[PDB]
């Protein structure tokens, strides 16, 4: 979903803006890496030759087996308008974007680049002691405040404004508090790479009147930078943007020179476990984690009982599950968290159980469930308990002069999908509040 999410955003941007977005090679070298392998293969072929190549020539390269991949590669390449289709002389000729072409040639052959990758002050700092600490703490603060755990130093209004304005962490003044939502637990369930892209993507949409291309000239360029080194200071919009980026633990500033951090390189490309936990049939939890982030997120749906330096022990209860569900966390996500953070011991025992099942009868292949099924069933049953009472807001229609009229109005409600219940014997039906006005208006006509 990582490359899909970034690519999807880059597709919606109008063509007139994409042409301007390729002026800086730093961005071109980043957009090039996100395309499918076949797309990169063809792009590299066209970059160095100043000619036009018919599409049929590209088709000839692909073998019969990989014909399907040739469809996705060309579609994704055309969506970003990198590849311009020009038809003339009865042939659908294919050419590469001149601005994209020049930028890539400059990047590979070391041509004039207009400081697209930045400069170096040659005043290095210690990466392990400061950069790792600074962004880890800065990224820790935003996630802790996200999870709802109490914390001393709350983040600045910039990210706070972004958090609320996003679907993440719904807030209400009447409630006076902030709580996580369905997408919120999903966000906390995503790897660091996607966890960072969600916030940056939301920031891109939030800004208004600061150019959209400049905010991308910085993020993609920020990937080109290497951790543990200085970069002297650029566009005017990139100054306030740089300070704004400083609140998400991406770039560290002593107070003239800014330093990217581990997360900065974590944006471009990819790259016992801490967080692994054991769940027993007694609805107990023992998490082999020493990190306040993991403990806080566990507290969303776990009743913590005590802690040691090496592990945390708690108990699953109806109160905790109800507390999580009320916030919009689905039971499917909870079991996903438990399964993907399972201890090796659970996996080994589950594998042995599967082996014995297949040993007696190898006909059927039962699914490999790492954690006991009773806990999953109980959690789902508690979700059903929340879903017991069903209520809709709407109106009841009655006292119809004629069966024809009752069927006419009720059938219309069914057609537009606003009918919730009907009874032919009583000539009554109930429709949702959303569709009331449409049904009333149709009744008059």
């Amino acid at each position: 979903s990582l490359k899909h999410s970034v690519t999807q955003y880059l597709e919606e941007i109008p063509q007139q803006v994409q042409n301007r977005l390729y002026t800086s090679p730093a961005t071109c070298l980043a957009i090039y890496r996100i395309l499918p392998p076949l797309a990169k293969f063809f792009i590299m072929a066209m970059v160095f030759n100043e000619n036009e190549v018919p599409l049929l020539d590209l088709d000839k390269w692909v073998n019969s087996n990989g014909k399907l991949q040739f469809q996705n590669a060309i579609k994704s390449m055309k969506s970003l308008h990198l590849l311009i289709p020009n038809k003339s002389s009865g042939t659908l000729m294919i050419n590469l974007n001149p601005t994209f072409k020049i930028s890539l040639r400059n990047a590979l052959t070391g041509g004039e680049v207009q400081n697209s990758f930045g400069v170096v002050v040659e005043e290095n700092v210690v990466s392990l002691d400061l950069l790792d600490e600074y962004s880890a703490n800065k990224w820790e603060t935003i996630l802790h405040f996200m999870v709802g755990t109490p914390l001393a130093k709350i983040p600045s209004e910039k990210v706070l404004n972004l958090l609320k304005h996003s679907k993440l962490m719904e807030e209400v003044n009447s409630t006076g508090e902030f709580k996580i939502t369905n997408e919120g637990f999903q966000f906390l369930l995503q790897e660091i790479n996607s966890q960072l892209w969600t916030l940056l993507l939301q920031y891109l949409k939030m800004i208004e009147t600061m150019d959209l291309v400049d905010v991308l000239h910085f993020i993609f360029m920020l990937g080109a930078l290497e951790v543990g080194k200085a970069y002297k200071i650029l566009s005017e919009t990139q100054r306030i943007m740089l300070q704004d980026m400083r609140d998400y633990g991406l770039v560290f500033q002593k107070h003239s020179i800014f330093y990217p951090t581990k997360l900065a390189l974590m944006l471009t490309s990819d790259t016992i476990p801490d967080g692994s936990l054991i769940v027993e049939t007694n609805f107990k939890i023992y998490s082999y984690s020493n990190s306040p982030l993991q403990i806080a997120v566990l507290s969303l749906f776990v009743h913590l009982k005590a802690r040691f330096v090496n592990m945390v022990l708690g108990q699953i209860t109806r109160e905790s599950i109800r507390r999580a569900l009320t916030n919009g966390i689905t039971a499917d996500q909870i079991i996903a968290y438990l399964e993907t953070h399972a201890h090796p011991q659970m996996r080994r025992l589950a594998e042995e159980k599967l082996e014995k099942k297949l040993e007696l009868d190898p006909n059927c292949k039962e699914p490999l469930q790492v954690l006991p099924p009773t806990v999953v069933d109980q959690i789902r049953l508690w979700q059903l308990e929340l879903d017991r009472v069903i209520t809709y807001e709407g109106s009841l229609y009655s006292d119809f002069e004629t069966s024809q009229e009752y069927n006419l109005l009720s059938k219309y409600a069914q057609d537009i999908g606003v009918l919730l219940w009907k009874d032919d014997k009583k000539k009554k039906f109930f429709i949702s509040k959303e569709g009331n006005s449409q049904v009333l208006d149709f009744a008059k006509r």
Binding site: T281, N282, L360, P373, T374, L381
Partner: protein, 142 residues
């Protein structure tokens, strides 16, 4: 004697495969042949009675043949105080390590030919039946 005769018959008689015990057989009765176990009533929240009752099938003779698993069913009415006692009367077996599995529906239960109280008439009759539950010479003269 009669209960002893019933016990022996249940053990060795192939026709009598099932019996209906009560609180007397809750503990200290050995049936090496019993493998399955059901309970329809219970003595409130006592956790021990559940374990003692389960003990009747924990010594099943064929407890070593490949894949064998004894069974212990607990029929409880939903939305009633029985669930309060059921979740409370199995707190000891959970500590030992046993895990209870929730069965909402028995597959293939509808196609059985005849089921008790399938018609509303019988259900109504049973409802009222259970509801209503609450001179030596003068010797010749007689």
């Amino acid at each position: 004697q009669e209960r002893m005769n019933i016990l022996q018959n249940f053990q060795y008689n192939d026709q009598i495969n099932t019996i209906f015990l009560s609180k007397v057989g809750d503990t200290s009765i050995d049936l090496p042949e019993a493998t399955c176990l059901i309970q329809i009533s219970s003595h409130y929240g006592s956790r021990r009675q559940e374990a003692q009752r389960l003990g009747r099938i924990l010594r099943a003779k064929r407890r070593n043949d490949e894949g064998f698993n004894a069974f212990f069913y607990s029929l409880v009415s939903k939305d009633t105080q029985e669930m309060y006692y059921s979740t409370k009367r199995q707190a000891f077996l959970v500590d030992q390590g046993y895990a209870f599995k929730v069965i909402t529906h028995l597959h293939g239960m509808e196609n059985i030919p005849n089921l008790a109280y399938a018609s509303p008439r019988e259900r109504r009759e049973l409802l009222q039946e259970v509801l209503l539950k609450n001179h030596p010479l003068i010797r010749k003269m007689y």
